[PDB]
Symmetry: C4
Subunit: 349 residues, 4 copies
């Protein structure tokens, strides 16, 4: 959905005064045909008849004018009502796929002028927005809230399985018993999860002001996932990988590529043909995830620990004296690495 159209869709989002008027018009089964332009003079030839009003906008005024036939002309910022009861006369030779004089007029006019034209069906109670060559049909709020609500429920289900997967991976990681299968399974869930969020965004956008709580739920559910998936990729790819590379991998499996177990294993740099092979490939975490999330060591300084110790297994065997010999690790950070790794080993294994 192009950005220029998304902006127009916001004009009639729940919570706007225009939307309140359109909902009132629908509730009384008036129809409407609304032309949005900034200079009525430029459009003098497609606007005929009716009444020149040049008055300030309000939902009640729009409502009252929709009792009459014809079309209503508004300023584009929805602050002025210019015309009511007009006859719109766009070029008849412009192709239209609509049935019905009001909807056909609406499409032809939107195409001809590059402006927004809103049609409200009198007895079907549908709001159709036309802009340039686009047609957006407006969903009612209950439909949107239903979709969004179901989507969040689904995310809860995915997030639960993701946490369960990850907590099992933690154990394996602390005991150095991790296979590629374990990692790829965890990454796949994270990707699928973030995918759901992606597909639900346009519903949440269209909710406008009524989608605030939805956004907060989405945020509490998923905010820390992407950080985690990136660190998992830095911990388990075939060879050393910049955070940026890892973020790119993430972006791709969200959007362009399908998170199949083989696909992920191969993008991770492992030469696997068939999925049952993943059970057989042994891997060790580099240690970035634990270093950043638990030892609170910045990634930049984390590169050094990993450069020197190679694996988390080796980091966990290091004394505090051994750790200080890393460029950027003093007694404070050395203690943090040391103590938090042992605390996790004691408590989790």
């Amino acid at each position: 959905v192009p950005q220029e159209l998304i902006e127009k869709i916001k004009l009639i989002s729940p919570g706007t005064e225009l939307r309140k008027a359109l909902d009132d018009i629908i509730n009384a089964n008036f129809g409407a045909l609304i032309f949005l332009v900034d200079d009525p003079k430029k459009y003098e030839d497609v606007i005929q008849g009716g009444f020149w009003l040049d008055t300030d906008f309000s939902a009640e005024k729009l409502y009252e004018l929709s009792k009459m036939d014809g079309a209503i002309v508004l300023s584009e910022d929805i602050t002025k009502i210019y015309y009511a009861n007009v006859h719109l006369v766009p070029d008849p030779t412009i192709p239209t796929g609509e049935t019905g004089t009001r909807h056909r007029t609406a499409e032809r006019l939107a195409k001809q002028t590059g402006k927004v034209v809103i049609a409200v069906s009198r007895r079907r109670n549908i709001i159709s927005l036309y802009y340039k060559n686009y047609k957006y049909v407006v969903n009612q709020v209950d439909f949107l809230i239903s979709k969004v609500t179901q989507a969040i429920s689904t995310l809860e289900k995915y997030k639960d399985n993701f946490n369960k997967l990850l907590s099992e991976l933690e154990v394996l990681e602390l005991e150095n018993r991790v296979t590629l299968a374990d990692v790829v399974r965890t990454l796949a869930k994270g990707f699928e999860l973030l995918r759901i969020v992606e597909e639900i965004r346009p519903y949440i956008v269209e909710l406008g002001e009524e989608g605030r709580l939805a956004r907060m739920q989405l945020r509490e559910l998923t905010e820390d996932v992407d950080d985690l998936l990136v660190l998992l990729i830095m911990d388990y790819s075939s060879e050393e990988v910049e955070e940026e590379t890892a973020q790119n991998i993430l972006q791709d499996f969200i959007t362009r590529r399908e998170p199949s177990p083989i696909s992920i294993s191969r993008v991770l740099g492992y030469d696997v043909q068939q999925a049952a092979q993943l059970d057989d490939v042994l891997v060790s975490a580099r240690g970035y995830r634990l270093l950043k999330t638990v030892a609170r060591i910045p990634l930049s300084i984390g590169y050094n620990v990993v450069r020197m110790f190679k694996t988390l297994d080796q980091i966990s065997k290091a004394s505090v004296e051994d750790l200080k010999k890393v460029e950027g690790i003093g007694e404070k950070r050395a203690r943090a690495i040391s103590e938090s790794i042992s605390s996790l080993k004691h408590r989790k294994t």
Copy 2:
């Protein structure tokens, strides 16, 4: 619900253009009577009057034609509108249980021709689909979404109790303190759970495109349960059982047989009359569940470990050298069995 009818029901599932038209017709309290045939000529004798249109289908065109009396004739793939305003004249001596000329016409016509006939009640806003001798009344989406939503909530409740049961069984299993009561209680919950999924399927099917999120939730909630129930049956039945036998047992208690504690105990091969006996029967897990799910040992090679060691208790006491003597266990799989069983014992008991 026969498969041939299920296909017809899909024609008017949420998300189809036909359904959008029927919903628009309902919203304006037009009625409708729609005859679906592939060759209008074959049916020249039940179709009378009206207008021959032979035009391409669309929701708006269907809407507009439903403003007129009589019936509308569509091609079966819903790509052509053949007729509007026709008088349908099926054989009057065909039995009908309907009241009202439009619904009676609809049933008689469906029976006589073997085709689909849709009746939309003008003021009751009901969509009735007739096909051959079947009558499907269409549920509105909000009703379906409500059912499906409640059903998923119920499944969450069952799934929680199932996980709690199973985690307690794990402890008992690791300490070799399992009674038949413990197993049968766990199996019963799993069966009841999978049963709910079965009963909710036709609701999710009828949702068509609007049931995508529901399907994903059902899948995240239950996908791994059946695997688990099968492995539990292989672990605790009276004598050795093929995976296929176990899958059959599962299928039955989902569908044909009621998962009573005594029923399950007896199908599991234990001679029990009254339920309080189950507390007294001591059992040991063969070890398949832990071998496949935790040691990632394929069932085929699992048969061998179990053939040699009989119980999970014995498998847990085996050294890594002892395990290698099993046909299909090398140092890698022997270590995995060994290490994962001890890790679970350390952490869970």
Copy 3:
């Protein structure tokens, strides 16, 4: 809500054919006035005019007859339609609190005959059931489903806090560090929980067939709670208490008495004036809860263990030989008591 009335309310519960007809009547804003009697002859004097039909009942027939003025007379089992378009003439000197000739007629007639009379308001879309001296207004399903859904959500919240309370009490119980405050807090949550279930029952009953999933959720959420509360009462009351006594205590705090911390402490047999005292009273569990739920020892035989050992603390210190000396404890049950108590101590403390 008296039982005789509850039975009448079931006649128009969601899922009944009568209810389907009433919903169709409401959807078209017909009104209705329906008299339910088993012998029309007995009532010949309150039934005037209209048409004698003596025909089989169906929703469509009822619908069609509600298009006409007056009242419809049905058999009480809703299998026969006796009359349509009748003028009901109950004794005018019977007091009525209703406004409107149809509702006033309905109440007076219900009172005079002891039968059911249903009034459906033509433009308010309300279903009023009158029986003897009762008036039940029917809730629409969406309203009921909303209440029930909210109630289950609330129960989830209570149940979570109950589990958290109880798991903390388990720790204290295994370490013999339990105060009366800890117990009373746990009991209070359980009582409040079971109370919610009580208040939501009439909503679930009125849902009829559409309340099946609700019932299953209520059952999965709460089924084991009452058993547990009873065992807690047997474990912590001032002196020894029969299971029946404990069940009675439970019943009371659900229904008749308000579960205040002081109230519960005193019904439990502890002489406490002010709530902060509860922090100071040390108590020990008798051991019944752990004996029945974990050792799977029947209450009858549990009385003996407790008679001999007094507290769970003492039971946990007993050898297996010491336990066998209890009437009803052999080597099997002695091992179960012994082993499960130590397993819990190892894992939970």
Copy 4:
């Protein structure tokens, strides 16, 4: 929303008989204009024509009178209907922002008299309440229930993250490895959580009687949070802080101040410029949270333990003899402190 207006809003809250009448009026698309006064005589000059009724109030009577034009005059306690079909004539020179004679009349009249005037739009089905200079538009219940339901869902999400944060802080606290970052992160979640509750209150208030379950859910979800946040503030602020000071801090970050990590750190008395510094500041809990919540030591006597031992770390190293030397600690409370701290250390670390 001023308190005097909130009281007026309660008059038409779900569950009131007035609200039931207004809903019936809306369902039939009658309009209404209702004037609430205690002495009709005082208002003889703005009330013209119509019928003097001086009769008792009921929803059905109000309904029936709304079938006629004009306005209805009620007593302020909604027990009397004084007038129907009257012509209200407030001073025309009073400014109004409304369109439409009924709404304009309503606002002008409310302003002129200081009384409540309710307007019900005939075809838009909106209830507008005017009182003095205020205008409250009434939300329909389904809209409110939707908001409230979404808000509780959101709170569940926040509460889950809060518990997870706090349980991790517990571990760090028991091992004396707490940074300011850990605390501030936990406080921020608690503040955001309590904030959501604050913003949702007016929705729950407007639900009136239909918001009972919502209130119970809000209460089960959040009741113990504020106590906990206060104790965290007493445990981690720069220097010693009275409970009252801490409660004040809480109140502020709920309402007046935005819970940014730097803002909280500084109000806590730590001189931090940029957020990454918080990772580097080491802190120790004073011990109040554990003393009150786990040792059940009253705050007053807690001041003394902390005065003598300074940190929880030191309290955990104290013998039972050492503890008794605190003013207000006898053998009972000394044992409780001692034993519960070690039980937590054993089980959590």
